Each structure stands twice: as C-alpha cells, then as structure tokens.
Amino acid sequence: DENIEKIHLWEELGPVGVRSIMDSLTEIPYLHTKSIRLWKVKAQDEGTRTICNYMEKSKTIEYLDLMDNQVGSLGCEFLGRVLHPQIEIPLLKLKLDHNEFGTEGLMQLAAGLCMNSVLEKLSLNYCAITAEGSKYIQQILSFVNTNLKKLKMKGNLLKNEGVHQLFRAFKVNKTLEKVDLSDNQFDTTLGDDQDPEANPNFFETNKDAIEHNKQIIENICEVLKAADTLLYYDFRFNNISKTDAKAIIDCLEANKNIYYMELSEHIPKDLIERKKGLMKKRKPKKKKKKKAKKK
Amino acid sequence: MDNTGKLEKQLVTLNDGLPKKPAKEIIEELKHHLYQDFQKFFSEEKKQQYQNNFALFDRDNDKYINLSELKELLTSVNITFPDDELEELYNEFCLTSPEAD
Amino acid sequence: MSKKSGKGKGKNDGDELGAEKEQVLRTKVESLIQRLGHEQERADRAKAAENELRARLFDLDKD
Amino acid sequence: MSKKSGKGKGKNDGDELGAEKEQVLRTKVESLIQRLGHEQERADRAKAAENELRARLFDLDKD
C-alpha cells in the first residue's frame, strides 16, 4: 500500500515505452513521486516532453536523473520550457551528464533555467559545452537572487575563455558553494616550449596568449580571495601550469575557508604537497547525524 | 461534560516551509517576474534604445557604469531623483559586484 | 558414498525440465547484463579518452 | 455472438504461468542481446575513435 515516491531504473525503455509510461503518469493524479533516476534510459525529446507535461500537471516531482540518455536539441527545448518560474515546479536536483547537446542544448535549457530558481544541484559534465555558450552561465552568476547550491562544469569545451567568463561572473557572485570545471580542455601551460634558444623570438610574439592567461590567473586569485562562500573546486584532468599552481597556492593563503579544491596532476609536486598540507586544516567537521531517541 | 475544556491558543510556530536550497538561484523567480514586466509591459523599442544608449555610455565596453556615468544614464533618460537614495542603491548593487568597478 | 542404490523415483520430469529452463534463462540474463555493464564501462572509458585527447595532444605538436 | 458464454474453463493456471514466464525470459534475452550489441558497437567505435585520435596525433605528425 505504498506509493512511487522515488524512481530509479537502469534499463533502456524505448521512446514509445517511455512516452506511454510518462503520459499515463500525467493522466493519473500521482503526486507521491519525489525522485526519479535513470542513466541512459534515453527519454530523448518525446520522453522529456512527457515528463514536462506530467511535472506541469502535477507539480510534485522533486528529483530527477537523466545521465547518458542522449537528450537532443528538442529535449533541451522541453527542459528549458518546462522550467519556467511561474510553473512552480518542485524539482530539486538536475543532472544531464553524457549529453552532447552543446551550445544549442545549453541555450534551450537557459531559456528558462538560465534564470530559473528551483533546483539544488545541476550537473552537465562530459557534455563538451562550448566556450561561447558559457555566456549563458555568465548571466546566471550576475544575478543577485541566489538560493541554489551546485553547478557541475567538468568535461566541457568552456576552455580558457570559459574560465575567464566564469571568474568574471564569480566577481559578482557571493553565494556559490561548490563548483567543478575540471576536464574542460582548459590549457594554462603553454606547452613544452621551455628552451627559448630553440626559438629566440618565441617570447616576443607570444604576448596576447600569455598576458591573457596571467589575467585569468589573477582574476582567479581575486575571486578566491573575495569568495566568502565558494570552497569546493575541481581542476582534475586539466592543463594547469606550474606557475599558475604556485600563484594559486600563494593566493589561497588568505582565504582559508575553502574546505576542498582540486588541481591538475602535472602541477609542481612540492606545490601539490604544500596545497594538501594547507587545505588539511580546511576540512569541514563532519556533523554527526543526530539520532533522535524514538519514543 | 462538566465543561472539561479546552481551548488551545494556536501559535503558528516558525517551523514550517523552510527553504532548503541555500545560495545560487532560487530567488531567481522574483526578479524574473519583474523582468517579465519589461518582458511584458514595455515595447522592445525602449529596450533597443537603452541597449544602444548604454553601449554608447559603456565607453570601455565593460558593460558597467560608475557613479558619475550611472547618473549620466539616469539623467539622459530624464530621471529626477534625490542624490542619497540613488547613491545607496548604487552602493548595494556594487556590493552585489564586489570585484567589479 | 560408493553404492548406487537409486530406488526408482519417477519424479515430475516436466517440472524438473521447466525449472532447468527457467534457471538457464536466469543465468543467460545475468551474463547478458554483466556483459552489457562491462561494455558500457569500456565505451565510457573510450569516450573519456577521446575527450582527453581532444584536450591533449599538445607536447608533440609544440615540438 | 460472443457476449455471455465466457464459460469457466478450468485451464491450468500453472502451465500458462510457466509458458508466459518463459516467454518473458525469451523477450528479456532478446532485449538484453540487442542492448549488448548496441553498446558493443558503441564501445568498438569509441576505441577506434580514441586510437584515431592518437592518430590525429599521427596525422598531425605525418603531415
């Protein structure tokens, strides 16, 4: 005599099957559902629109999970439209990993989600989000209204321009808690061009890229210094230079509230040890689950 | 029976409907609806006019205007407001952008 | 231990064969799901390596 | 006409239960095999794409 409050399945359901299931859900007053998790069930456009109609008719779904489901452009259109702010949708945490929707999909989401005010955790990792589309996220951070928690940006094509735009946005953002941008092709190290005698003039022409990277790292330092809330970071599988590593090490010294961070593996080993030792003091104290004596 | 009471003075305790999601977006709704006013009430002509006028104002193309230039833009649109309150509003919004001039 | 004193029990042949078929089907399904999981893991690894290469391939080009 | 005479044939519930459960297991095998084929094609293509990404390294260095 229980109800379907959380859904978690891992088998492909087919567009016809998913559509019929979700439309039957919509036509049934089933408001007990609170979470649904599917990886690669491939809801796609039709399934996504079905869940959108169900959500708008019921307005009771709170958790969702759609990784590796191959959500297309029209699927992102549905996701953006159903996420309107007058819908009053109870969705809590959103995740669309393994979905190469790109800039088109990210814009379709941002249609309503760029200024949406519902979720807690939204993940789009391994989505190859293009750097240009990061402008949309730029509009999300410049907003002064802020009661969301998480944003995952690992494994996309945001790149150096994306990181600069994100840090510009952070310059005004005062409430971000955890951010993950690793594995995003972000190239800080110029490369192996460390023997100048091989190319004597390589320094003269290399003015824009190096100055831009130094500006990016300086903005990173300023954001981390002024960041009174953001304390979770991930830079794994990224191209982070040793000089940038040492600069970040020196800069983070002032902001000691950061309870977790990540850096690329090829950063200086001594700098890695220094960062680990410094952040050891910053680990949050695990709050014991208060076990109320049932009576 | 026997008038064994008993009325209860129902004090609505502040322990219901506490928001759960701390610090990224969830207030985004309010201003969004406010935006819909100029996402509704206003013709796009004034939107384009203000876009171009500010881009003219944004001499450095930084999307931002300082105190003097913000008063510039307000006056150019025929805004008549006391110095003080506009000053506090600008200060609040600059606090919302601590790392932006 | 060594004797073959198998009294002539004529148990239900049909039910035993049906149970054998159902057990075969369950074993086949579990093996299929195992292979599906490993193949999905390998494909995910391959795609992650592809994205890694797209970000990578820098040292030799710069050389 | 086929209106009223739904006579209470005493058909064996267990026999059809076994038959349709074997039917369901066979459909499950078909679906699992198709999914495994799709994912194995995906994994092989991803492996070839990563190899040919190191071969984008190869193509760069061969140019």
Side-chain angles (χ1 to χ4, degrees):
Chain A
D1 204 37
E2 279 195 356
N3 287 311
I4 289 178
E5 286 182 350
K6 292 183 184 151
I7 284 178
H8 312 266
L9 320 182
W10 56 87
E11 68 287 352
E12 48 172 53
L13 314 181
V16 185
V18 178
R19 174 201 88 207
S20 302
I21 304 171
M22 188 66 203
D23 289 359
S24 294
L25 287 151
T26 303
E27 55 96 22
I28 297 306
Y30 209 68
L31 300 179
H32 296 89
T33 304
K34 316 307 178 184
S35 178
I36 298 165
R37 291 227 274 175
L38 291 176
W39 299 358
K40 191 176 185 292
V41 307
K42 318 172 194 161
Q44 294 181 5
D45 291 331
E46 175 56 14
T48 298
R49 187 276 298 300
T50 62
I51 296 89
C52 297
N53 186 359
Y54 175 83
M55 273 181 148
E56 180 169 344
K57 75 92 181 180
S58 66
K59 310 198 182 212
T60 54
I61 298 296
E62 289 170 14
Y63 191 104
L64 190 59
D65 188 308
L66 268 291
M67 283 74 75
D68 198 353
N69 278 293
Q70 313 161 4
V71 179
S73 52
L74 191 65
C76 290
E77 187 274 331
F78 301 140
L79 307 171
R81 195 206 71 201
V82 75
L83 267 289
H84 282 110
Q86 287 167 349
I87 315 300
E88 190 276 331
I89 47 174
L91 182 59
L92 305 176
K93 187 195 310 215
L94 177 55
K95 309 194 210 135
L96 294 184
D97 307 345
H98 290 274
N99 293 278
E100 285 71 2
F101 54 89
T103 302
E104 174 52 29
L106 189 153
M107 183 278 288
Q108 298 309 346
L109 277 296
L113 277 176
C114 83
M115 185 180 288
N116 186 275
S117 89
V118 181
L119 201 71
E120 293 105 8
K121 308 189 176 142
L122 176 60
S123 182
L124 301 173
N125 70 19
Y126 290 95
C127 289
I129 291 301
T130 62
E132 193 276 334
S134 278
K135 83 209 177 185
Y136 299 110
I137 296 89
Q138 179 176 5
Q139 282 178 356
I140 301 169
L141 293 177
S142 306
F143 211 87
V144 66
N145 295 336
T146 181
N147 280 340
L148 178 68
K149 76 193 294 187
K150 164 63 80 170
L151 168 54
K152 301 188 169 197
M153 181 65 38
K154 178 175 198 237
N156 287 296
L157 275 293
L158 303 202
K159 200 61 176 61
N160 41 54
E161 275 294 351
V163 302
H164 201 61
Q165 282 302 355
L166 288 182
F167 276 92
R168 284 311 221 160
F170 296 150
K171 293 187 184 188
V172 301
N173 191 0
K174 271 280 180 186
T175 53
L176 174 64
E177 299 192 0
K178 311 206 185 227
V179 64
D180 286 331
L181 322 184
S182 48
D183 196 16
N184 273 271
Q185 299 194 356
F186 181 38
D187 194 347
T188 80
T189 304
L190 298 169
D192 284 308
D193 286 1
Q194 312 212 359
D195 183 357
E197 273 203 0
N199 192 3
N201 309 350
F202 197 69
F203 287 84
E204 66 183 1
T205 51
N206 291 289
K207 192 176 178 184
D208 274 336
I210 291 162
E211 294 294 328
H212 175 67
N213 290 350
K214 187 264 288 182
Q215 288 285 321
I216 295 174
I217 300 300
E218 279 174 352
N219 277 331
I220 302 187
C221 288
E222 284 177 6
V223 173
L224 299 179
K225 299 158 189 169
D228 301 324
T229 55
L230 189 51
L231 317 177
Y232 176 94
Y233 303 78
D234 197 330
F235 283 167
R236 296 179 302 150
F237 315 102
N238 218 342
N239 200 357
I240 306 171
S241 70
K242 295 186 182 165
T243 62
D244 297 328
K246 168 54 70 71
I248 291 171
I249 297 300
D250 292 333
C251 306
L252 292 168
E253 290 180 332
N255 196 337
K256 300 174 185 170
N257 297 324
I258 300 168
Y259 58 83
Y260 183 90
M261 287 183 281
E262 285 293 342
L263 277 297
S264 293
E265 301 189 351
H266 65 93
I267 59 173
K269 303 144 296 170
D270 68 299
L271 306 202
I272 297 169
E273 193 278 330
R274 177 178 168 206
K275 177 267 292 178
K276 279 172 179 171
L278 290 174
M279 319 305 170
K280 288 311 150 290
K281 301 176 182 178
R282 306 172 182 185
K283 264 203 170 187
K285 198 253 193 177
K286 275 190 172 181
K287 285 182 181 177
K288 280 182 177 178
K289 278 183 176 181
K290 65 183 291 183
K291 287 180 178 180
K293 46 153 187 60
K294 278 186 171 186
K295 269 190 177 188
Chain B
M1 294 295 287
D2 279 277
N3 202 15
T4 59
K6 202 174 183 180
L7 285 170
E8 275 189 85
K9 310 158 184 178
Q10 262 203 324
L11 61 94
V12 188
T13 310
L14 285 72
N15 265 352
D16 276 333
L18 284 71
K20 300 182 177 178
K21 331 191 193 166
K24 190 180 173 194
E25 79 174 5
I26 281 186
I27 309 96
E28 292 269 340
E29 268 173 308
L30 312 178
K31 261 180 188 179
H32 190 288
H33 301 130
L34 180 149
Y35 274 105
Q36 286 265 337
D37 307 336
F38 181 72
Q39 297 185 359
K40 185 184 287 185
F41 298 114
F42 303 81
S43 184
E44 277 63 28
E45 59 91 16
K46 277 296 180 183
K47 173 190 169 185
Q48 73 89 32
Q49 182 187 15
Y50 275 75
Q51 301 193 108
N52 296 348
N53 279 354
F54 181 94
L56 297 165
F57 295 129
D58 190 6
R59 310 274 195 172
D60 68 328
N61 199 32
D62 78 331
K63 309 183 176 188
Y64 304 155
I65 53 172
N66 76 67
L67 180 65
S68 59
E69 273 155 332
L70 168 49
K71 192 170 187 169
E72 277 195 273
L73 197 160
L74 308 174
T75 309
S76 79
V77 296
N78 199 42
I79 297 187
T80 52
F81 273 67
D83 193 307
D84 51 358
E85 182 191 336
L86 295 183
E87 196 165 276
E88 291 88 6
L89 292 166
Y90 175 80
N91 287 316
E92 171 185 84
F93 277 123
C94 295
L95 182 63
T96 76
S97 300
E99 287 79 57
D101 203 32
Chain C
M1 183 278 288
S2 62
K3 186 178 284 187
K4 255 174 182 170
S5 73
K7 230 174 179 174
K9 211 184 176 179
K11 237 169 187 182
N12 211 352
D13 305 337
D15 76 13
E16 205 165 6
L17 278 71
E20 181 179 1
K21 289 183 184 184
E22 207 183 359
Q23 182 178 0
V24 173
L25 292 173
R26 275 187 178 196
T27 301
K28 211 167 178 179
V29 171
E30 198 184 6
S31 76
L32 303 169
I33 290 181
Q34 300 168 193
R35 214 162 183 177
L36 187 151
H38 279 105
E39 201 61 21
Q40 280 170 348
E41 187 185 3
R42 264 71 196 165
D44 302 345
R45 276 183 196 130
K47 295 180 179 65
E50 295 161 276
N51 195 0
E52 204 167 351
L53 288 173
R54 193 38 200 167
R56 273 165 192 231
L57 290 63
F58 61 95
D59 55 357
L60 279 72
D61 169 64
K62 177 158 277 200
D63 299 325
Chain D
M1 294 185 280
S2 58
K3 253 187 181 176
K4 262 166 182 168
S5 78
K7 225 183 174 176
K9 218 183 178 179
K11 233 169 184 181
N12 210 357
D13 276 332
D15 282 331
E16 209 174 9
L17 261 68
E20 184 177 1
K21 276 186 184 181
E22 194 160 347
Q23 196 184 12
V24 167
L25 285 168
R26 292 193 171 215
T27 304
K28 219 164 178 175
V29 174
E30 199 179 4
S31 70
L32 273 177
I33 300 175
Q34 281 180 13
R35 213 181 177 191
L36 183 60
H38 291 105
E39 200 59 24
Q40 285 171 351
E41 272 301 88
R42 211 175 167 200
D44 282 348
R45 272 179 190 130
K47 299 188 293 286
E50 180 201 341
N51 264 16
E52 286 322 282
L53 273 173
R54 214 54 175 186
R56 185 243 138 257
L57 262 177
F58 164 84
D59 267 339
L60 163 73
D61 185 73
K62 285 296 183 295
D63 210 1

